[PDB]
Design a binder for these strands. Structure first.
Length: 607
RNA sequence: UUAA
């Protein structure tokens, strides 16, 4: 419990506590003993054992980070995986340690794998079991993500090419079918797979990682199919970053452990011939034309437990602009601890093998990370309508209603149940719940007060198991064509509406909204929210909303199918009642009125 | 117990 952020043990065989199976989070779980850094970690309550480590590997690429968050200025709804990654990236940067969930992104991943070298998606739709990770499944996802990001990067607004320009490896595929006759394809590949290697020089110059990259960039094999065709692969490109998918054998995997300093912090290299080998900045360059220097930016290692469980962790380097320095971080699921370079590169530990190494251009690893509000954003969907249904007495916004930093308006959202506890395997944990409706009403004092402006039902094609409108207000017609007299729209657009609001600094009021933000998968700052459940709180025993609608003023909002519209309305005018009682000196004089009167009334009065 |  106490010393779990210890990331080393004196025995090469004992796995340090920082690398082992964290306790499940499944209710006010306090994360401060697990992360003292200003860099958030990710909630492990997801379907995928492996993607968590990879997202962290990617968040600290300055060049890919700055792009994925960058495209959030514009409204890119159809490219689900890239803008949801952007919402996640923007989330992690601003939480500054606060726990993050990748739930939204994981839903978009499973969304497109369930849609149809198509064999990539089918294999990656092992979202369902996840021995918790199998061999080469991380590298399979590293390729899948980079591939399906670049495909989506062509469908932006003002279509950009940036990710290809840095993960683009021009692979010449020359298949010598006959003699004096060879066919060649040239494919742009996002990652470089170091896989399936035969008897290979590993001993002489020396035992470092560099030759392994060399073979994967210049090699031609004598195995195919009744022909046994021999085929040529070489890359005429040294891109800004190099995502290496390491995939070896366990025999080859413990020899590499014993060669000390097997990785390389920084390497330099160019292409002299149409082959490619790089030196160790030992200036062994036989000829010279444009030179490139690469430092290691991060990598994802697989941890085999002392109890023989498996997880993935992420080592990362980040440069500081106030002083020339490299800080190295390791990311267990929500365990984030700052460690020294020496321990971050060491591979002598048998329980640790590398799976996805990435190298990055030196001059642009030392490039800063830029917020999305470094740019200026399209806020249009706040003042427009984007409905996917045929088609709620609400009125839309007007440009004189430009929400500024501090606009107090009320929010309430409802969700539905898809999969239950699904537990007792290691107690497995409750996983699935998806949101369906969300309403934001005007709470700025004026002619337009208490008036809703967004009341949007969310599309959902997935299987519903419990609808439960005694608490949700969802008519079963939550599928896109058969609109339940409702304005159904995609999940991505109304996330943007909420995101834009907290991004500029609106103040949200409502009842237990941190729970609501947990389900819409967003993090609002502590000071940008007025929770009536926290204001009228007596240390415990969170009071109802129907009770206080009845016991603090005259409405009776109980026993009706909960209508997100008016529960946000009820929450709005209560935060104003809390304000009249706080401006006067009767705060606790009125606080002790009703939970004293409710204890003799069992906290439930006639409706 | 809000929350659902």
């Amino acid at each position: 419990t106490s010393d779990i952020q210890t990331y080393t043990s004196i025995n090469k065989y004992e796995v340090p506590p920082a690398y082992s199976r964290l306790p499940l989070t499944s209710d006010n779980f306090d994360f401060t003993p697990f992360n003292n850094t200003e860099y958030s970690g990710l909630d492990p309550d997801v379907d995928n054992h492996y993607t968590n480590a990879i997202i962290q590997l990617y968040r600290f690429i300055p060049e890919m980070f700055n792009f994925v968050v960058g495209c959030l200025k514009d409204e890119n709804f159809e490219t689900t995986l890239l803008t949801d990654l952007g919402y996640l990236f923007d989330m992690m940067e601003r939480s500054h340690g606060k726990i993050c969930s990748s739930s939204n992104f994981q839903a978009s991943l499973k969304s497109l794998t369930d849609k149809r070298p198509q064999e990539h998606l089918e294999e990656y739709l092992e979202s369902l079991c996840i021995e918790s990770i199998k061999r080469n499944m991380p590298q399979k996802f590293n390729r899948f993500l980079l591939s399906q990001l670049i495909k989506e990067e062509a469908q932006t607004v003002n279509h950009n090419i940036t990710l290809n320009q840095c993960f683009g490896l021009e692979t010449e595929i020359r298949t010598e079918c006959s003699c004096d006759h060879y066919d060649t394809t040239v494919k742009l590949l996002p990652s470089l797979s170091i896989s399936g290697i035969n008897k290979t020089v590993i001993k002489q110059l020396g035992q470092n990682i560099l030759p392994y990259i060399e073979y994967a960039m210049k090699n031609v094999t004598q195995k195919n199919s009744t022909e046994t065709i021999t085929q040529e692969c070489t890359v005429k490109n040294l891109p800004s970053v190099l995502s290496l998918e390491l995939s070896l054998l366990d025999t080859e995997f413990s020899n590499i452990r014993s060669s000390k300093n097997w990785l390389t912090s920084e390497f330099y290299g160019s292409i002299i011939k149409n082959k490619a080998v790089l030196r160790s900045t030992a200036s062994e360059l036989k000829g010279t034309s444009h030179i490139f220097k690469y430092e290691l930016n991060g990598y994802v290692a697989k941890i085999t437990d002392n109890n023989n469980e498996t997880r993935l962790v992420t080592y990362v380097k980040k440069y500081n602009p106030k002083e020339n320095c490299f800080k190295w971080l390791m990311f267990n699921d929500y365990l984030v601890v700052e460690i020294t370079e020496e321990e971050a590169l060491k591979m002598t530990y048998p329980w640790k093998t590398p799976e996805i190494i990435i190298y990055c251009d030196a001059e642009e690893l030392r490039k800063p990370f830029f917020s999305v509000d470094t740019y200026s954003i399209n806020y249009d969907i706040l003042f427009r309508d984007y409905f996917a249904n045929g088609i709620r007495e609400y009125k839309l916004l007007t440009h004189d209603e430009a929400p500024k930093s501090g606009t107090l308006v009320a929010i309430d959202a409802a969700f539905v149940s898809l999969q239950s506890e699904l537990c007792e395997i290691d107690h497995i944990r409750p996983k699935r719940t998806a949101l369906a409706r969300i309403s934001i009403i005007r709470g700025e004092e004026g002619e337009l007060y208490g008036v809703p402006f967004v009341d949007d039902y969310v599309v959902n094609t997935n299987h519903i198991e419990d609808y439960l409108t005694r608490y949700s207000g969802i008519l079963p017609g939550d599928l896109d064509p058969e609109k339940s007299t409702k304005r159904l729209v995609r999940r991505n657009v109304v996330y943007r509406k909420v995101w834009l609001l907290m991004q500029l600094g609106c103040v949200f009021v409502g009842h237990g909204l941190n729970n609501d933000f947990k389900h819409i998968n967003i993090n609002v700052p502590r000071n940008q929210i007025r929770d009536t459940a926290i204001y009228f709180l007596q240390g415990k025993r969170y009071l109802s909303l129907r009770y206080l609608a009845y016991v603090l003023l005259g409405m009776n909002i109980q026993e009706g199918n909960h209508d997100s519209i008016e529960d946000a309305h009820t929450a709005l005018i209560l935060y104003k009642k809390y304000l009249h009682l706080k401006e006067k000196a009767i705060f606790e004089k009125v606080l002790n009125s009703v939970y004293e009167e409710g204890r003799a009334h069992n906290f439930k009065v006639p409706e």
